[PDB]
């Protein structure tokens, strides 16, 4: 798409025509090539708890996961990492590990990203996948839609009720703290910052 100077020339050009610019923001997960995840799986410093890791019993090339939770695109939502020798959680794909939002260091890093783009002059944000932000820490199994189905065959996302992996207690308070961070850039009149959420 270009460089950072191409973005800054676009933001200035949008403002000279009287337009506003909002961008997407992805708080739920990163790539597994992010620098936080490469430090997380070697247990380096504070980054050890940036992602959700749990013990598993990977043998014969196959993983026994800690529970029955499924990915949105459909298989187990736990993936074994060979360097860490633990399993990490992902809501969408195994290349997209979920951030641990019960860690307050993670919540501080998301706020610095928001301040970065608001300083560039972005007029607002669209928040993606906010209902996936928190999961239950008790790690109990979800309820099957068909209770006589054998659990070896439960692999599709629509075969479970997602009572423990979507819309947990404390999720709306994280979205409200995002609104509080953007309120420090909204005090000047005519420069209110927009926050929209996507939950489909």
């Amino acid at each position: 798409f270009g460089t950072m100077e191409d973005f800054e020339n676009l933001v200035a050009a949008i403002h000279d025509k009287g337009l506003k610019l909002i961008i997407d923001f992805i708080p739920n997960h990163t790539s597994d090539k992010h620098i936080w995840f490469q430090l997380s799986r070697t247990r380096t410093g504070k980054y050890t708890d940036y992602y959700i890791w749990h013990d598993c019993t990977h043998e014969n090339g196959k993983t026994i996961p800690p529970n029955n939770w499924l990915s949105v695109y459909g298989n187990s939502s736990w993936h074994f990492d060979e360097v860490r020798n633990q399993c990490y959680f992902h809501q969408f794909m195994k290349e997209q590990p979920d951030l641990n939002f019960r860690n307050p260091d993670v919540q501080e890093e998301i706020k610095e990203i928001l301040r970065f783009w608001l300083t560039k002059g972005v007029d607002g944000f669209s928040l993606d996948a906010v209902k996936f932000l928190l999961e239950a820490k008790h790690l109990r199994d979800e309820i099957q839609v068909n209770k006589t189905q054998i659990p070896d065959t439960v692999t599709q996302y629509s075969e479970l009720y997602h009572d423990f992996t979507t819309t947990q207690v404390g999720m709306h308070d994280i979205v409200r703290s995002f609104r509080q961070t953007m309120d420090q850039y909204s005090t000047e009149p005519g420069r209110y910052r927009f926050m929209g959420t996507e939950a489909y």
């Binding site: 000047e188 009149p189 209110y192």
Partner: protein, 458 residues
């Protein structure tokens, strides 16, 4: 008064409400940042070359008034009569209307944060300032001058805050609005001419510099030295305030802004942003309270030649104030704000003022061929009133041949309507003329308790 304290009256009179209102319409006509700062410097040159021409006439002739004794010595009684008529109904009430409308733009704007305040609130708060200042100055002759010292003190505090905060932010590297300063401009003689109208409104007051600054320890040296120092010091403050605006604002954000200083004070002074609508509003009614002091000085000397109604410039017996002249200026100023619109009263004021600025400066060149043997202590080089005459021809003819709007027709039709009154009341002393005027003079005298001023010329 010395030299250094002579600068203080020149700066304090010129710096007013103009620098808080005019930067939007100078930029709107020359649509780049680069030519906008060239215009604010070129109006500082016109204001000092114009005030040097008035300093020569003010020590040559030595009669009080304004441009009225300068026009009488050069052309006769016809353009002298037209000046006292056009300053009675056009020049002085529109100056009072622009300032009181400029006060109301700054009181209303912090209550409409991202929004535009409706015209009924701007006009009915400006009308309440015209009536309140006309009531105070018609009752309490000493009260207007005591509060003037705290209005001048509040004026140059908010000027020093804007200039210094613009130099601090420019030091930190906020120079990205001056990058390609000359891309997108107008070489149009209607857009350049209207940027000169609004730029010279903020410099207005250079022609009233003659009389109250003759009280110096050594005139004919300290008066032309107070103009070369005093007005280019104002030009240094006006360029620095406009540079201070463009460090926090784009040229697009400055056009889409109601009051340009409340936008500055919202980005720089956040937890105390209300001090900019508080000090600018104090500085603005200080500029309107100052003009009601000298109400009647030109009225008295034009009435002495029979060129003005003498019921004006009468003095109330209780509360020794020129109450007929103050009440008359308040009525015409409230009539002017109902069609209203700063950027329409500025063009209406500037067409009439610069028609008569260029007639007295041309009268300086006439009085060198017709009026020798006349003892000139201050003497300018002859090229200074020549180019100041040709620039005044450019500021009069170019708006009506490029962008002729309807306010330039009402300004001509009000000046030449005085030319009819010259031929019915001055040139031909008809019998039915003073059968009307002295009944009005006698009945207004008992209605207001106003007497002839117990005062001869000096």
């Amino acid at each position: 008064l010395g030299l250094i304290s002579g600068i203080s009256i020149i700066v304090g009179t010129i710096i007013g409400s103009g620098i808080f209102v005019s930067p939007k319409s100078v930029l709107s006509n020359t649509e780049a940042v680069g030519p906008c700062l060239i215009i604010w410097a070129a109006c500082g040159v016109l204001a000092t070359l114009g005030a040097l021409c008035f300093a020569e006439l003010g020590t040559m002739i030595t009669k009080s008034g304004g441009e009225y004794p300068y026009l009488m010595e050069a052309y006769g009684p016809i353009p002298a009569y037209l000046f006292s008529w056009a300053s009675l109904i056009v020049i002085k009430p529109t100056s009072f209307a622009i300032i009181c409308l400029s006060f109301s733009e700054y009181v209303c704007a912090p209550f409409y944060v991202g929004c535009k305040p409706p015209q009924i609130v701007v006009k009915c708060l400006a009308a309440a300032a015209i009536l309140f200042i006309s009531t105070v100055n018609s009752l309490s002759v000493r009260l207007g001058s005591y509060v003037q010292n705290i209005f001048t003190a509040a004026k140059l505090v908010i000027v020093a805050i804007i200039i210094i905060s613009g130099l601090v932010l420019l030091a930190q590297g906020n120079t990205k609005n001056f990058d390609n300063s000359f891309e997108g401009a107008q070489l149009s003689v209607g857009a350049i001419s209207l940027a000169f109208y609004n730029g010279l409104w903020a410099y207005d007051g250079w022609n009233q510099l003659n009389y109250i600054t003759e009280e110096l320890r050594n005139p004919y040296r300290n008066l032309p030295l107070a103009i070369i120092i005093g007005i280019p010091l104002v030009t240094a403050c006006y360029i620095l305030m406009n540079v201070s605006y463009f460090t926090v604002m784009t040229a697009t954000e400055l056009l889409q802004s109601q009051a340009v200083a409340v936008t500055f004070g919202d980005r720089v002074l956040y937890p105390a942003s209300w001090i900019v609508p508080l000090f600018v509003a104090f500085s603005t009614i200080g500029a309107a309270n100052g003009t009601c002091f000298t109400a009647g000085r030109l009225i008295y000397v034009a009435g002495r030649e029979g060129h003005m109604l003498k019921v004006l410039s009468y003095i109330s017996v209780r509360r020794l104030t020129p109450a007929p002249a103050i009440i008359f200026y308040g009525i015409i100023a409230t009539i002017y704000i109902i069609p209203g619109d700063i950027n329409s009263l500025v063009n209406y004021f500037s067409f009439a003022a610069w028609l008569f600025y260029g007639l007295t400066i041309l009268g300086l060149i006439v009085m060198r061929f017709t009026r020798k043997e006349l003892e000139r202590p201050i003497k300018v080089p002859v090229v200074i009133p020549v180019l100041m005459t040709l620039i005044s021809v450019f500021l009069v003819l170019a708006p009506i041949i490029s962008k002729p709007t309807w306010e330039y027709l009402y300004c001509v039709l009000f000046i030449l309507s005085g030319l009819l009154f010259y031929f019915l009341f001055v040139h031909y002393k008809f019998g039915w003329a003073q059968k009307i005027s002295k009944p009005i003079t006698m009945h207004l005298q008992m209605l207001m308790e106003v007497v002839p001023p117990e005062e001869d010329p000096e």
